[PDB]
Design a binder for these strands. Structure first.
Ligand SMILES: Nc1ncnc2c1ncn2[C@@H]1O[C@H](COP(=O)(O)O)[C@@H](O)[C@H]1O
Length: 645
DNA sequence: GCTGATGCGTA
DNA sequence: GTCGGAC
DNA sequence: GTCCGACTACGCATCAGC
C-alpha cells in the first residue's frame, strides 16, 4: 500500500521496497511520501539519499515516468525557454480549496494566513470526500499533466476552468497529497531540496541503478563492490558529468530521454552547448570590500569591469544567420528586441559565422548619449514587438564570449575568451560596446575605478580572474565572479531612519511570526507619516522574533489618522507608530504606489527604496526624529544616474 | 469596451 | 535583487 | 562555501466584473 512507502528506509531496495508493480504508472502518493521524508530532515545529504531512492525505483520499473517525477520535485512545468506559467494566484487557489472541501472562503483564507501554508489547510478538510466513493488514485504523470493543463488555459473565462481542474485533484487526493498539490500550485513547495539537490539525486540514482536494463534489472547497486572511499569519488565524478551537461543544456526534455537509452557516460556526446539552446549563465558572489577581493583571489590575476544596470541578454547567432536572445532565466527574449536583431550585422567581422555573447541590455538616450535607469528599460513592451514601435533604445555592453565559429569556448580561460571577443567584434558607440575593464592589482587604482563606475551610471564593479579557475564551467562553481557594489561598504551608502507603521503575517519559514513590515518617512509640512517601502530581509531569526513580541503590544484595530499609505498593500496589523529602524538600500526609485515625498520630484509619483534591508533598531530615536520626505527627496535628486538627467 | 486587480518576469 | 540558516 | 527559501520594487500583460 503506498501510504506505507518509506524511501528513507535503511538499506533501501528499489524493486522490493517500491509500492507499484513494474511497468505500472508511478503513483503520486509515492511522490508525496518521498516529499514528507525530505521536508522532515535538514541535511541535504539525507535529502539527496531519499530522492535518489525514489528515482532508482522509478528507473527500474516505470522509466517513462522519470521526466514527470523530476519535474514534480523541482516544481517545474517544463523547459524554462518554453514559457509555461500556471496563472493561478493565492486567491484563486483559496477559492479552489474552499469549494473542494465544502468550506466558507473567509474561514479558509483566515486559516491559510494563520498557518502560513495553504497545503496544511487543503489537507485537513475532507467533506464530500464522503458522499462520493473515492476516485481512482492520483498518478505522478497524471498530476503533472493536470498542472500543464491549468497552465495551458488562457483567455476569457479561463480562471473558472483552472479552478475545476484543481478541485479535481483535491477530490482525488488522499493522505498527504492535498498538502503538496496545494503547495505546488502556490509555487511554495518548501522541501528544502531544489535544483542542485535534484541533479545530485538523479546522477547518484542512475549511477547506482543504470537504465536500459532488462527487467528484472541485472545490477541494482553498482556501488556495492567498491570501498566507501572509492564510492564517494565515483559518485562525485558522475554528478559532475550531469551537472556540466545540464549547465550547457538546462533542459530535461532533451537530457532525460537521452539518458534513458545511452546511459550517463554518453550524455556529453549527444547534448553539447549549441546556438539556439540557452545555457545557465555565470553568477556573481557579493563581496563586501576590496580587501575581501584579495582574500578570495589571493595570487590569481584578475580584471575589474563596470557592472551595468540593465538586464542580461544572452545573444545567440547560429550558422545560417538566424538570431535568438535569452534572459538569464532562459526565457526566450528574441521577440522582445527587434532592434537588436537588425543590428547584429554591425557588431561582428565578416569572418564570424556563429557566436554566443554574454552582454547587458541597457536603456540608452541617444538625444543625450548616456545611460537611463533600470525603471526606464522596463517600460519597453515584452511579448512580440514590431520594430516600428520601439521607444526605449537599448545599447549592448558585451563582457563575455561563450562560443565562436562552431567551437565551444567554455573550457578556455577568460583572458582567452576576452581576446577572442575583442578580436572578432566591433564597438559602435551607443549601440554595442565592450565592458569598461581595468586590469590591475593596485588597491588605489581599484578604488578610483569603483568611484568612477558609479559616476558613469553603474552599480559598482565586477571582478573576474583571468587564468586561474577562470573558465565558464558553471558546474565547477556557479558563483565564480565577484560583485563589488557601492552599497556593500560600511559607512558608504544611503541609510534611512524609518518608522514601522504596519506588519504582514509570515509564510513558510516565517509562519507564526511577522514576515514583513511597512515603513514610513515623516512629512513635516502635512504632519503625516507616508509609506515609503516594505521591509523583509536583514534581520536574524532572533531579531525577527524580538520584533514579533515587541510590536504585538502595539497592534491597532485601525490606522492613526496621520498615516498615509495610498497605493501600498494594506498591512495585516496596523501598528502604533513608535519604532524606528535603520534601513539601507541600493537606489531610490520613482514609485507608482508609495506616497513618501509625492510632489517633491514628480507631480504625480512618490519615491520608494530599491533593495531595502534592515540594519538595526534606532532605540534612541522617535517617529518625529525619522528621515523626512524632504530628505528622501534630497537623497533621490543626488543619485549619480539622476544628476545625469 | 472600460477599469481595477494581480500574475510574473526582470532586477 | 539582499540576506540569514543549516550543513 | 554551498544550497535553499524567507523577503524587496516596478511595469507589462491578462482577465473578471460590470
Ligand atoms: N561586466 C559585467 N560582467 C558580468 N555581468 C554584468 C556586468 N555588468 C553588468 N552585469 C550584470 O550583472 C548581473 C549580476 O548581478 P547580481 O546582482 O548577481 C549579471 O547577470 C549581468 O546582467
Amino acid at each position: 500500500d503506498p501510504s506505507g512507502y518509506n524511501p528513507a528506509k535503511n538499506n533501501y531496495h528499489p524493486v522490493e521496497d517500491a509500492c507499484w508493480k513494474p511497468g505500472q504508472k508511478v503513483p503520486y502518493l509515492a511522490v508525496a511520501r518521498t516529499f514528507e521524508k525530505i521536508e522532515e530532515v535538514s541535511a541535504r545529504l539525507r535529502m539527496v539519499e531519499t530522492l535518489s531512492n525514489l528515482l532508482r525505483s522509478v528507473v527500474a520499473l516505470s522509466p517513462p515516468d522519470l521526466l514527470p517525477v523530476l519535474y514534480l520535485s523541482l516544481n517545474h512545468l517544463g523547459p524554462p525557454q518554453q514559457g509555461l506559467a500556471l496563472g493561478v494566484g493565492d486567491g484563486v487557489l483559496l477559492k479552489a480549496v474552499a469549494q473542494a472541501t465544502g468550506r466558507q472562503l473567509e474561514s479558509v483564507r483566515a486559516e491559510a494566513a494563520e498557518k502560513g501554508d495553504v497545503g496544511l489547510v487543503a489537507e485537513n478538510s475532507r467533506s464530500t470526500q464522503r458522499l462520493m466513493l473515492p476516485p481512482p488514485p492520483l498518478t505522478a504523470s497524471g498530476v503533472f499533466s493536470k498542472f500543464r493543463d491549468i497552465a495551458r488555459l488562457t483567455g476569457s473565462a479561463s480562471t473558472a476552468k483552472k479552478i475545476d481542474i484543481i478541485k479535481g485533484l483535491f477530490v482525488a487526493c488522499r493522505h498527504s497529497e492535498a498538502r503538496f498539490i496545494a503547495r505546488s500550485l502556490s509555487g511554495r513547495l518548501r522541501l528544502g531540496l531544489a535544483e542542485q539537490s535534484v541533479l545530485a539525486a538523479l546522477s547518484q540514482a542512475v549511477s547506482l541503478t543504470p537504465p536500459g536494463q532488462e527487467f528484472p534489472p541485472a545490477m541494482v547497486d553498482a556501488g556495492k563492490g567498491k570501498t566507501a572511499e572509492a564510492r564517494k569519488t565515483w559518485l562525485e565524478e558522475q554528478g559532475m558529468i550531469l551537472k556540466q551537461t545540464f549547465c550547457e543544456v538546462p533542459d530535461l526534455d532533451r537530457i532525460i530521454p537521452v539518458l534513458l537509452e545511452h546511459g550517463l557516460e554518453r550524455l556529453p556526446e549527444h547534448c553539447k552547448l549549441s546556438p539556439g539552446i540557452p545555457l545557465k549563465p555565470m553568477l556573481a558572489h557579493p563581496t563586501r570590500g576590496i580587501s575581501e577581493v584579495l582574500k578570495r583571489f589571493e595570487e590569481a590575476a584578475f580584471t575589474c569591469e563596470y557592472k551595468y544596470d540593465g538586464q542580461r541578454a544572452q545573444i545567440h547567432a547560429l550558422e545560417g544567420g538566424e538570431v535568438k536572445i535569452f534572459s538569464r532565466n532562459q526565457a526566450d527574449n528574441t521577440g522582445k528586441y527587434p532592434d537588436i536583431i537588425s543590428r547584429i550585422p554591425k557588431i561582428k567581422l565578416p569572418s564570424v559565422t556563429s557566436f554566443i555573447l554574454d552582454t547587458e541590455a541597457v536603456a540608452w538616450d541617444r538625444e543625450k548619449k548616456q545611460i537611463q535607469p533600470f525603471q526606464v528599460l522596463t517600460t519597453r513592451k515584452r511579448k512580440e514587438v514590431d520594430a516600428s514601435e520601439i521607444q526605449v533604445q537599448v545599447c549592448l555592453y558585451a563582457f563575455d564570449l561563450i562560443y565562436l565559429n562552431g567551437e565551444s569556448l567554455v573550457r578556455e580561460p577568460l583572458s582567452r575568451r576576452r581576446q577572442l571577443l575583442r578580436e572578432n567584434f566591433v564597438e559602435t558607440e551607443g549601440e554595442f560596446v565592450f565592458a569598461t575593464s581595468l586590469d590591475t592589482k593596485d588597491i588605489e587604482q581599484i578604488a578610483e575605478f569603483l568611484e568612477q563606475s558609479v559616476k558613469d551610471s553603474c552599480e559598482g564593479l565586477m571582478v573576474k580572474t583571468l587564468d586561474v579557475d577562470a573558465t565558464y564551467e558553471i558546474a565547477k562553481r556557479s558563483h565564480n565572479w565577484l560583485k563589488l557594489k557601492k552599497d556593500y561598504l560600511d559607512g558608504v551608502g544611503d541609510t534611512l531612519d524609518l518608522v514601522v507603521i504596519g506588519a504582514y503575517l509570515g509564510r513558510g519559514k516565517r509562519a507564526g511570526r511577522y514576515g514583513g513590515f511597512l515603513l514610513a518617512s515623516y512629512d513635516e509640512d502635512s504632519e503625516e507619516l507616508q509609506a515609503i517601502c516594505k521591509l523583509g530581509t536583514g534581520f536574524s531569526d532572533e531579531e525577527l522574533e524580538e520584533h514579533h513580541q515587541s510590536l504585538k503590544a502595539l497592534v491597532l484595530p485601525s490606522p492613526r489618522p496621520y498615516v498615509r499609505i495610498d497605493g501600498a498593500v494594506i498591512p495585516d496589523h496596523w501598528l502604533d507608530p513608535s519604532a524606528v529602524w535603520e534601513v539601507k538600500c541600493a537606489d531610490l526609485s520613482l514609485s507608482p504606489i508609495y506616497p513618501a515625498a509625492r510632489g517633491l520630484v514628480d507631480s504625480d509619483k512618490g519615491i520608494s527604496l530599491r533593495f531595502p534591508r534592515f540594519i538595526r533598531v534606532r532605540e534612541d530615536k522617535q517617529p518625529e526624529q525619522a528621515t523626512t520626505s524632504a530628505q528622501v527627496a534630497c537623497l533621490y535628486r543626488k543619485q549619480s544616474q539622476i544628476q545625469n538627467q
